[PDB]
Amino acid sequence: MMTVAHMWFDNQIHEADTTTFDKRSPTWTALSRIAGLCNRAVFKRDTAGDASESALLKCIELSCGSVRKMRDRNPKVAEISYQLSIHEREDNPQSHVLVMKGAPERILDRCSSILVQGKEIPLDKEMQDAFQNAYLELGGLGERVLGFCQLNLPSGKFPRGFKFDTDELNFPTEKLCFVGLMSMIDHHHHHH
Ligand code: NI
Ligand code: NI
Ligand code: NI
């Protein structure tokens, strides 16, 4: 049974509440959403979906509340299974946000920018290294590591009700904004 153990964002490793750290950061707001929306899985309880998304669903459910309700005000418009999905932003219904997850390194390659304390900054060398190092620690704990990114689709070219072509990409899947990593562990010993 999977459970999110750690995560990397705002350039810092975080412990997942086994009972994230500071939720204040808007970066955590986005990661949380990417982990809840780019996720097919419903009901640490009885799952229905693959292991990883099961854990994510549990993590976000406990850390942020009803993901059921999160998925409700962020209508799925398109989807693929990396894994991605586009939604009508709760923020402003008129625009869309592309949420994607998958292999850390492959994910990283599709990102030009990255969020640090809510601020989007180019994903230069320094940051790529911060990522490699993080990716090394978490993977080194024998945990399954996932990468999370998103992209606020321009409302001009992708207005509300734009027919996204899931097969033949009718949109961009490159130059996304890296948000964070989330590592999960395959077992437990006791509960607190
Ligand atoms: Ni730890
Ligand atoms: Ni153990
Ligand atoms: Ni203990």
Side-chain angles (χ1 to χ4, degrees), residues 1-43 45-192:
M1 191 145 76
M2 299 289 227
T3 47
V4 175
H6 305 80
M7 55 216 106
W8 180 75
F9 68 82
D10 284 353
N11 196 204
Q12 186 65 41
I13 294 294
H14 297 84
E15 303 292 327
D17 184 354
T18 207
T19 291
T20 162
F21 268 151
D22 165 280
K23 288 79 182 302
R24 287 284 29 179
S25 178
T27 299
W28 161 254
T29 290
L31 185 58
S32 158
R33 298 166 99 259
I34 302 184
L37 309 161
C38 188
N39 188 300
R40 299 173 162 191
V42 199
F43 303 90
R45 305 160 172 164
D46 323 336
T47 193
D50 94 304
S52 293
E53 280 174 39
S54 305
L56 300 166
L57 162 69
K58 303 192 198 72
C59 174
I60 302 313
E61 179 76 32
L62 291 166
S63 291
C64 313
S66 172
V67 342
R68 170 281 166 305
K69 186 123 71 170
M70 174 180 26
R71 290 172 181 176
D72 270 14
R73 210 118 182 192
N74 286 83
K76 286 201 80 319
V77 186
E79 187 183 64
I80 298 184
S81 301
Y82 61 58
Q83 292 107 55
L84 69 58
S85 47
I86 295 172
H87 311 243
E88 276 150 20
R89 297 182 61 194
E90 190 189 10
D91 306 83
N92 38 304
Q94 306 310 312
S95 66
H96 300 291
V97 54
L98 185 171
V99 298
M100 173 185 291
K101 77 194 182 304
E105 254 141 32
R106 299 324 111 190
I107 286 295
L108 195 265
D109 287 319
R110 298 184 166 290
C111 297
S112 40
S113 63
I114 183 182
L115 269 196
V116 186
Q117 295 302 340
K119 206 278 154 45
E120 183 161 357
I121 67 171
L123 209 185
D124 58 30
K125 182 230 204 80
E126 192 181 10
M127 292 314 292
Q128 289 172 53
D129 298 359
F131 160 100
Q132 235 263 281
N133 184 50
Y135 185 31
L136 285 170
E137 175 175 353
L138 305 175
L141 285 147
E143 308 187 348
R144 187 183 300 188
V145 192
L146 287 184
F148 300 75
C149 60
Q150 69 178 191
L151 178 56
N152 283 299
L153 302 175
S155 40
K157 304 183 186 189
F158 305 96
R160 263 210 57 175
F162 168 100
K163 305 295 186 60
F164 302 97
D165 190 53
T166 278
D167 171 1
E168 146 81 58
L169 285 324
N170 197 22
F171 52 70
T173 54
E174 277 295 323
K175 288 183 165 60
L176 320 176
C177 173
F178 190 94
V179 173
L181 304 171
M182 286 176 106
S183 43
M184 303 143 282
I185 201 159
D186 62 8
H187 67 283
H188 66 281
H189 299 262
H190 56 276
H191 314 274
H192 294 287

